Amino acid sequence: GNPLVYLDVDANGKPLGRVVLELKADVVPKTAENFRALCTGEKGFGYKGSTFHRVIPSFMCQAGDFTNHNGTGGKSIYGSRFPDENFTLKHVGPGVLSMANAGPNTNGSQFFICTIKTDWLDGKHVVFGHVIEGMDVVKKIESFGSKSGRTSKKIVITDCGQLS
Ligand SMILES: NCCOCCNC(=O)[C@@H]1CCNC(=O)/C=C/C(=O)N2CCC[C@H](C2)C(=O)N[C@@H](Cc2ccco2)C(=O)NCc2ccccc2CC(=O)N1
């Protein structure tokens, strides 16, 4: 019964394809529900039109700051921040979907998709899903990043929603 959601991504207006994500509501229901609702936009806000603002090759692709588009913003469906739900799931390799944060219990809407095993984040960021389809799209996104995280193209979530 875990939901499937999708992000359609383009770079400087050129479509990259669709990333499909399974959300592990069986393990982190509160975190999964937040992401699902931000994909559908059913609360009146969410990810559509927001960007991957920080992309670091051989690390991760970060997105979801739909208020400030720069890593300082975002908000969850519960409020501006909500706590770390649990650290049961681990950053085991590429395709892991995990919450960005600025310290303990600062989850909002920002998230990242790993391109390697980021196991030093275990117990520090809440893992809540993984890529079902479209790792090749993620690798395309990654190819527009840099060591600093600055991107070389504008990477936009042109559509998102829930598949099941
Ligand atoms: N650069 C070349 C060096 O390469 C080595 C690899 N670098 C690493 O491992 C680095 C090493 C240490 N730097 C950082 O923490 C970068 C901080 C950074 O950018 N700020 C600008 C934006 C506002 C501040 C500060 C912030 O903190 N905003 C949140 C996003 C967020 C806000 C509210 C909820 O969520 C964020 O962005 N958290 C960072 C993040 C996000 C996702 C996954 C992991 C991590 C840890 C990480 O990236 N750690």
Author numbering: 2 to 165
Structure paper excerpt:
Cyclophilin D (CypD) is unique as a mitochondrial cyclophilin and a key regulator of the mitochondrial permeability transition pore (mPTP), a transient channel on the inner mitochondrial membrane that opens under oxidative stress or high mitochondrial matrix calcium levels. A key structural feature shared among all cyclophilin isoforms is a shallow and highly conserved PPIase active site. Adjacent to the active site is the S2 pocket, a distinct exo-site that forms part of a long substrate-binding groove for peptides. In particular, three gatekeeper residues (positions 123, 124, and 145 in CypD) and one far S2 pocket residue (position 118 in CypD) are highly diverse among cyclophilins.
These results were verified by surface plasmon resonance, which yielded dissociation constants of: JOMBt KDCypD = 19 μM and JOBBt KDCypD = 45 μM. We used JOMBt as a scaffold to reveal structure–activity relationships and improve potency against CypD (A series). A26 engages CypD more extensively than JOMBt. JOMBt is reliant on weak binding energy per residue on highly conserved cyclophilin active site residues, while B52 owes its potent CypD binding to unique S2 pocket residues that are poorly conserved between other family members.
